[PDB]
Structure formats: C-alpha cells, structure tokens
Design a protein around this ligand. Sequence first.
Ligand SMILES: CN[C@@H]1[C@@H](O)[C@@H](O[C@@H]2[C@@H](O)[C@H](O[C@H]3O[C@H]([C@@H](C)O)[C@@H](O)[C@H](O)[C@H]3N)[C@@H](N)C[C@H]2N)OC[C@]1(C)O
Ligand SMILES: CN[C@@H]1[C@@H](O)[C@@H](O[C@@H]2[C@@H](O)[C@H](O[C@H]3O[C@H]([C@@H](C)O)[C@@H](O)[C@H](O)[C@H]3N)[C@@H](N)C[C@H]2N)OC[C@]1(C)O
Ligand SMILES: [NH3+]CCC[NH2+]CCCC[NH2+]CCC[NH3+]
Lengths: 195, 203, 52, 46, 148, 97
Amino acid sequence: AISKNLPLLNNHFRKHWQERVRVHFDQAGKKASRRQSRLRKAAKIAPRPIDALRPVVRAPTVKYNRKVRAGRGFTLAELKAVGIAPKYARTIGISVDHRRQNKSQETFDANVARLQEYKSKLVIFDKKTKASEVASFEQVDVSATFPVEQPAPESGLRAVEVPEQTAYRTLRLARNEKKYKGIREKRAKEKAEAE
Amino acid sequence: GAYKYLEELQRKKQSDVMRFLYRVRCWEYRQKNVIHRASRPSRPDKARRLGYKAKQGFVIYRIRVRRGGRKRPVPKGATYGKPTNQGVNQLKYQKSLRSTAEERVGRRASNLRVLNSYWVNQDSTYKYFEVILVDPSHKAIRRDARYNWIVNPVHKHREARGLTSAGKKSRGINKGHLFNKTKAGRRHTWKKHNTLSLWRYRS
Amino acid sequence: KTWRRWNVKVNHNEKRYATASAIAASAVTSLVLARGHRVEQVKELPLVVSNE
Amino acid sequence: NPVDHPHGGGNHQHIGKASTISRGAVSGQKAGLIAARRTGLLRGTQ
Amino acid sequence: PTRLTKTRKHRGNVSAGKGRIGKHRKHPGGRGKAGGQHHHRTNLDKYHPGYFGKVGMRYFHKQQNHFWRPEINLDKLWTLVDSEKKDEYLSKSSASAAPVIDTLAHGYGKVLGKGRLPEVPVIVKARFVSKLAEEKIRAVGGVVELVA
Amino acid sequence: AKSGIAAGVNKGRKTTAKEVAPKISYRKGASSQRTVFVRSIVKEVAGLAPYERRLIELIRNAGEKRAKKLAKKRLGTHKRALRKVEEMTQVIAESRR
RNA sequence: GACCUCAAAUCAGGUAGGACUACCCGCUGAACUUAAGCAUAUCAAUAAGCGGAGGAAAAGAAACCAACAGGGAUUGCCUCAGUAGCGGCGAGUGAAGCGGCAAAAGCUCAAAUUUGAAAUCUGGCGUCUUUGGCGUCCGAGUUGUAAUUUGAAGAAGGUAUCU
RNA sequence: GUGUAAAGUUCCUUCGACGAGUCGAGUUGUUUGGGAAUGCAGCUCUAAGUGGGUGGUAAAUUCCAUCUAAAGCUAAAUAUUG
RNA sequence: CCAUCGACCGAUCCUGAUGUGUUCGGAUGGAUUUGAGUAAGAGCAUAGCUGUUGGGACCCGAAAGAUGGUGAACUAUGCCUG
RNA sequence: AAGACCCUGUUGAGCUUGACUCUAGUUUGACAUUGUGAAAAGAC
Ligand SMILES: CN[C@@H]1[C@@H](O)[C@@H](O[C@@H]2[C@@H](O)[C@H](O[C@H]3O[C@H]([C@@H](C)O)[C@@H](O)[C@H](O)[C@H]3N)[C@@H](N)C[C@H]2N)OC[C@]1(C)O
Ligand SMILES: CN[C@@H]1[C@@H](O)[C@@H](O[C@@H]2[C@@H](O)[C@H](O[C@H]3O[C@H]([C@@H](C)O)[C@@H](O)[C@H](O)[C@H]3N)[C@@H](N)C[C@H]2N)OC[C@]1(C)O
Ligand SMILES: [NH3+]CCC[NH2+]CCCC[NH2+]CCC[NH3+]
C-alpha cells in the first residue's frame, strides 16, 4: 500500500464518483449559442445599448485595495449629484445600487464624472424624433465606450526628502504602540485614580 | 387600529387574561375533529400578517398534531446494523410540527393552495395550528393581481415541497456563513461539490 | 468511457512555430514534389497570382 | 432446542438456571415460575 | 499510445511480468495509506518523517488575504522603472529629481534587501520594508516612503 | 482619519471623508409615540407574568444578585436579565409614588 | 324577525386524485466496502422506500460579505483549494470570503380614519361588439373589501415654478 | 383625450406604525469543515425597542462595524441515461 | 562538479547601547545548537515510456451483510362447511 | 464431488454466557399537561 519515496497523495475517489462526471463536450456549442443569443438580444432593442452603465468601485480586502473594478450600480447620492431620480435612471440605461454607500470623496467623484460623461453622450428619443434620426445611430458598446480605468501609479521624477526616523523604525514603533495600547491606558487610569 | 393592540396582547401569553383564553380554547379545539374547518381566524391580526384577506376564496382550517419526537418505526426496536444506528428513542423528525399541520391540511383540501400557517394553542399532547388556504379556481383570486401568482402550477402543493415559511425554515434557506451547506439547497450543493468537472482541454 | 481524453493542448508559440515552418516549406520545390503535388510545370515557387 | 425456549438444549434435559423469573424480566424470558415468592411443596397452613 | 506499452511485449509470457511466485493479487498490504504505523512504518519513518502527530496551534476561519504581502528584493527593484526611460534615469537622477517606484501598485507588499542597487538615488514607496533594505536605499541617496 | 501607513493602530490609507446621510433602516430600534401608547395600555390589560411577579418580590427583599440569577435562567442571557431587572425596579418605584 | 355555530341536497358552478423518469424540491434511510482485525469513523448525509413540481426546478433583491481606500439580490463556470478546518488527529475527509468571467431586473404585503359617505368583490338575471363590456338584484364584507405606504423609504401639512 | 385629474422632481416643518410560543437560552438527537457546539428538529424556559441578529475560542466589562429576522413574488446565465 | 574552513537570512540560548507610555525598546558582541535557506535565478507548459495511489482497476471465483418485494396450489397448526 | 475429517485465513454463520459495546420494553425522579379552596408545620 505504501512504498518507495513518493509524495503522499490525496485522491478523493472513494464515493460513487463515476455517477457524477460532467464532461463539457458542449463547450463550443454553448459558445456558439451564447453568441447567437447576444446577437438576437442586441437586434431586439437596437440602437439602445445592451449593457447598462456601471459604476467604478474599489475592490475590498488589503490584497485588492490597489485595484478598481466595475460595481453593481450607482449610489443614490451619486445619482442625486447629477440630478437623476433612481426610478428614472433605470429607464435610460443606468444601473442603480441602493446598498452601496459613499463614505469617501474619490469614488464619489469618479462615478459622478462617469454619469456626466454618459449623460453628455445620451440622446433620448421621443414621439417627435423621426425614423431617419433613429437610423443615424449605431448600437454602442457601453462597457467599451466607458471603460474602467486603473489610476496610473506615480512615476517620473521628484525630490528626495529623508526624514530623520527610518521607515523601519516607524513601522516597529507603530506595531509596538498598537500591541501595548490596551495595557498602557489601563496603567494610566489606575495610576491616576490612586492620585 | 385594533390590530396593533391585538399584536401586543398576543405577546403576553402568560398574563391571566391570555392564560384563561388559552385554557378555554384548547379544551374547545380538543373536543372537535383533528382536522376541522374554522369559520374565521381566531387571530385575525396574525392571519393578516401572513397574507390572509377577508375575501371569498380564503379559507382557514384548524388541526392538532401530536407532540414529541419520532420513534423509529422498526419492529421490536431492532435496526439490524452498526451500533451508531441502533437508536430508536430520542430521535427527531427533521420537519417541524407546523409543516406537518400544513401538509395534512393540504392533503384534506386538495383543491386549494396552502398559503401560510400559525400557532394557536398547545397542551402536553398536541400543538394546535391554523392554516391559511387560497382557492386557485375562485374568480375573486384569479382576478386579483396581488394573489394571481399562486394560480400558476409551479405552486402546486408548495407545502409538500418545503416552500412555505415553515418549510424554508426547516430546509435552512437563509443567507450567510451559518447556512453554507443549505443556502442553495443541501442536496444540490452536495452534488455540485461532489461532481468531477472535466473540460475538453484538461488543464 | 466518455471521459477519455479526446482533445490535446499545444503551446500556442510552438503551434505558431510549426505554422511558420510549414509556410517556409511551401517555397521549397523539392518538398512540394515529394509531398506529391504536380508542380513540375510551374516556373518558380512561391507561386503568386494577381489580385484579379 | 435453545432457539425455541430458554429451557432448550443441553446433553441432558435440565433447566440449567433458576426457573424463578423476575417480574421485571422481558417477553421471551418469562418462562417458568414468574415472580415466585417461594417454591417447593407447600407444608403447613398459609 | 497502447502500441508502445510493455503490455504488448508481455503477450505470450504467462505471468505478464508479475512473477510466478508472488502472483499479482488484489491488495496485499492494504489499501491506500493503511498500516502507516504498523507494517509500513519502515517506509513512513524513512521517507516521510513528521507524518504522525500535531504541531502548533489551530486558526479557525483563516483568511489568506490578510497575509498577502509579495516580496521584492533590491536587486530586482529597477525592473519596475519604465523600460524606455531606465537608461536616462540611471544617468540623470539626483537628489532633486529621483525616480519614484510604487511597489504596491506593481503588486508587492514588502521590499527586502538582497542584492545591490545602482549608485543612483531612488524614491521607494512600500507598505513594509526590511531594516537592511531601507539602509541600502538610503546609502545610495534614496528614501523609503511608507504607504498603506 | 487613517494613519496612512500599513501597521499600527488606525492603519490604512487616508481618503477625503464624505458625510453619509443615515439610512432609514438604521432607525429600526427606535420607539414611537404610537407604540409606547399601545404598550402601556396592553400592560394595564395584561398584567405581569408569573416569573415577573416572582421577580418583584426578590427585588423588594433587596435580592438584586438573587433576582438577577433568576432573570438569567428565565430569559436566557445575562444581557436580557439586566434589562428585565431594571424594568421591574421601575415597576416598583412607580407603585409607591 | 335577526345573529353565531353547525348540518343536508343527484342543489348552481368548479376543483383534486392517476401516468412518465433524465434533470428538480423535500422526507426517510442501509449494508457490502475502507480502516490490511474492529465498534467511532468510512462507504454516505449514497442505494432502496415515501411525498411533491416544471420546462426547467430551486434560489433570489441581505437580520449578506467583510475589517478594505471597502463590496452589494440569486445562480453557474474558473480560481480559492485538496487549502482553513474536521478526523480511534488513523484510514480518511473538506467548505467560505475575496479575484476573473457567463447572465443580469427588480419588487409586494402586514402594521395608518375613506369616515364628507365599502370608494371593493363572487354569483344570478337581462343584454352586447363575448379570454370580456354594460345594467340590475341578492350575497360577501366593518371580526375590514378598495385607493394610499414598504424602510432604497414614506406620510400629513406647506413649496418653486417646473416636467 | 371628461387630464380644474394621475404622476414626478426640489426645498421647509412635524412625524415615521416595520411580522412572538417568535427571537433568544438550556438540553436531547441528528448533521456540518464549523472546532466550550454549523444547520435542523423535539422538550423546558421565554424576550425587547436604538431594540434585535451577526462579527468562526467559552465568560463578564466597554466600545466599534454591519445589516434589519420571525410575511410574500420574480426572467436570464445552471441541470437534464425521460 | 567534489572535499574542506568561513561569511549572510530565519528559529533557539546568552549579552544588553543611545533611549523610555519604567516596561517597553534591542544598538553591539558571543554560542560542540537548529532550517525542506543565501552565496550572478531555472522554471512554466505540452507530449511519451516506466513507476505510484484512489477508482469494478489484469480476468473469473466466496461463505456473508443490507433494502424493497412475492409465496400456506406442498407442508405445519387453528377455525368453518362437507 | 474444487475432502464434509484436520490445519490455515486477521473468511463466516447457528447457538450460549458473569465477554466488549448497545437496545425494544419496563421501572424510578423531575419538568410540562395543571386549575380552585382550607389547615398544620416549617423560611425569608
Ligand atoms: C553560531 N556559531 C556558528 C556555527 O553555528 C556555524 O554556523 C552555521 C553554519 O555552519 C551553517 O551552514 C552550514 O549549513 C548550510 C546549509 C544549511 O545549507 C551550508 O550551506 C553551509 O555550507 C554549512 N556550513 C548555517 N546554516 C548556520 C550557521 N549558524 O559556524 C560556526 C560558528 C561561527 O561558530
Ligand atoms: C564561486 N563562489 C561560490 C558560490 O558559487 C557558492 O558556491 C556554492 C557552494 O557553496 C555550494 O556548496 C555548499 O553547499 C553544499 C550543500 C549540499 O549544502 C555543502 O555540502 C557544501 O559544503 C557547501 N560549500 C555548492 N553546492 C554550489 C556552489 N555554487 O558559495 C561559495 C562561493 C565560494 O562563494
Ligand atoms: N455523511 C456522513 C454522515 C455522518 N456525519 C458524521 C460526519 C461529521 C462527524 N462529526 C465530526 C466531529 C464533530 N464536529
């Protein structure tokens, strides 16, 4: 059962695994049909775009802080700042997210900017609009026309400015302050109250 | 109105007034059939909160259900296997008494759809429930835009499939890390986690 | 069984290498004749013909 | 034979344990003298 | 392919290469890692010491993202400068105009100190830094700027 | 608000803060003039539960710690026991005035 | 003469049952087997047994995830990861958050005095331009049927002219 | 067009009802990767109103964060030896 | 590439500077100790033979165990009518 | 007729018991079902 110098393995095949095997023989067929569905859906509503406009959000988790991605929908405050009611925004290709909040300024500004760009490029037709102007427009890809752009990292040239305390010492002191904060402020009280 | 007062009063189940009412009504319910039609809800505010309306086509049934656990129904207590499976007493049914009440009432009134249910009373032998029922075939239901949905055949015997409030409770259908196993259906999630997924170009 | 391995992955760069090598081979008359093509009465390879 | 009765079997016919059975014994065990207060020939008054 | 296997070469030989005495049988010795403490101890103690037992403390609900901190050493740090302006930066960089290196935006958590820098001032932005890494950066006239 | 470095207390990047209008859902626990009125009437109609009466008597006899152990067993948690004991002492205080 | 509760009718009109098995929602539930023995464990929350659907079902617009510069209904794929963890800590077993992608869609009640007017609804009868419209008469309904609100709010008083 | 009507947007004032033998707790059995207890169910106890739940080591003390249960509907991407 | 004496990083034992939330900090120098480390990267991917582990697992073979059904036309025993 | 005797196998089964580990049933207590009065002892 156990023999010569080999890695010890973990092959989980002790249940009736052969009753539950999924082979994606239909990978190409599903690609083609998913493509045909996109085609039909786009032809149904032309020239209106298929994709609603989406916000730009920071990814959570200290591993993904640096990145920014597409979110679910614009906040109520972001829409308020551009003068668009939430129930009206849904009828003009703008996504809405009542759950996301705007605690800071940067993301709010970026999404207000996206909304203003989209509103500047938007043309709402009405009963007066003729078929010849409706035929003038091509179905625009919204996620390509309003892409999520990573802010560029700082580069180039700048003056060198050396603080007297090292970065390493700053980090060590910050760790020490955090670590002993609770017991030091307990000592501060019990010494004070005894005064 | 009065419904708020009834709501707050029904939360005082140990006051003298409520203890008296529960005693008298438990005796009365225990005198009638195990399943009987109720001419009206005994808790109209509670029934309203669960979807009842005082319209034609809304029906209330009462049922008592025997309390306690599930004795394993094996002859003479013999289970014929390993000691881990030898238990007969102290075993528990995985569905609640409320769901049993719903299912038995649904079996009796098979022309109707079970909407929801609520507790009404309790003694040491029985728990008493009232089951709210809707008639799919009544025009007062079929023409009502707030209740048309239950006419669709996908809601046939939703109480037998664990689709009522009590059923979705017992199935563990809730959001978050405490319901990882049952969130999307326990057996579906197990099947997904126990499926070997092979692609054409095997990585 | 259906879950036998049917398709095979090839590195994309190596596949491009083979494509380039096969294109280069098409300009070698000895290789084209060995391959069995009746290119005895063509002046030069590659054979390029006008866009008409 | 032993399958049939608690008294069955053996290379002679004999009961092999006390025939007085507890009142608290279970079905399949109550054969013999069930919860006997005494045994043997009755002598004297009762 | 099957035509290249030794099964083809064993055709016509009785035991298929498995021996007449030993006789390839079903599971002599048990299945899997059976007997790791009994009749396979001579394998496990030789080739997998440490296999049996418990060491250290448990960590319930460990989230690996808390511990993300990819490391970059000083000998590699100039790869992060734009490749088209690296030659120019090596010549023109001074105390008043030095290249900025945003290590976190390049996906790194800590600057370690293996290797040698070009003798050119740089400005290094990092979440964490080792003591020697900062010391070598300051020695060529540079600085480490902590970011979060 | 954040320190601007990756370690220590109050760590993290500094952003320009923006004030957020509180969500209406955050008011859930607040009492209203409707509910306070109705609950006071129901208490008059209903009266106290048997453990509540038994809990008054403990507090009147200066058995705070003894009333707290009973309230924790009856209600289940020490947090809920504390609130019920405070509630019942306000029941006694009003009774005298 | 009402009412409440409870009955009967070959009363007027409806409705349910049974079938099929690949997939679906639950209940109930093994042992062979592995552990080189074996009882916890494993096989397996599997087979068999029972109840209930559809073209999909189920789930679903947070009593969520997180701990970040924060994400934002549900579902699936890839990854996380054979990892954290569980385990005679043996044999074995084993998810989730983040990240990329497919697809994207949102909402409804209860709790509120219409109170200057039950404004609501099934049925019968007549009629028409009949998946229904109109008129009328019983009946249901105040122990609450409509309109109005659903937390992202929203209501009652004002508001600015707008749209 | 029965539009002195229905709706939307902005500002100001006062308000802002929000689901109970349920939540939650103990215990028993079962199950889970969930470990001083993951879900489910039985029995006993049984709430509150800035309250309640969660925050993966039991407890008390003080904070913080995040949602808003115990009522309900809903296409698509997913499955498919019929 | 090999033998050997060192140097560097982490764990362990000692030492303990300027300083201090006076209990933290850890400069500097040591130690028959320890690591699946460093000391001018070698890996990633596809394929092939052989070898390994889980799978029906080279092929055929138990005595057994479990779940759900079908039989008192033979025969055992009671009852009813001849 | 792949010994039915004998031995071996970490292969069984029928049977037994003061084997190991359990179990139907039964018995004993507590809590609930569960209310209304009075008296005597005890307790704060
Ligand atoms: C602290 N005292 C040290 C003593 O420990 C020793 O140093 C060892 C050294 O020999 C080890 O190094 C040893 O092992 C490594 C191996 C791990 O790769 C080899 O590369 C190296 O050639 C070999 N000498 C090194 N890994 C740790 C030091 N403390 O060297 C003598 C000494 C100075 O007295
Ligand atoms: C030319 N410079 C060399 C440098 O290349 C390097 O040499 C290593 C040498 O130290 C290693 O060898 C080392 O490590 C091995 C290892 C098995 O533990 C030890 O057995 C050996 O004693 C030790 N010297 C050798 N395996 C590779 C060379 N490139 O380190 C030593 C050096 C002199 O600085
Ligand atoms: N499919 C397996 C059914 C039996 N369940 C046992 C697995 C979990 C055993 N408890 C693990 C230890 C308790 N945390």
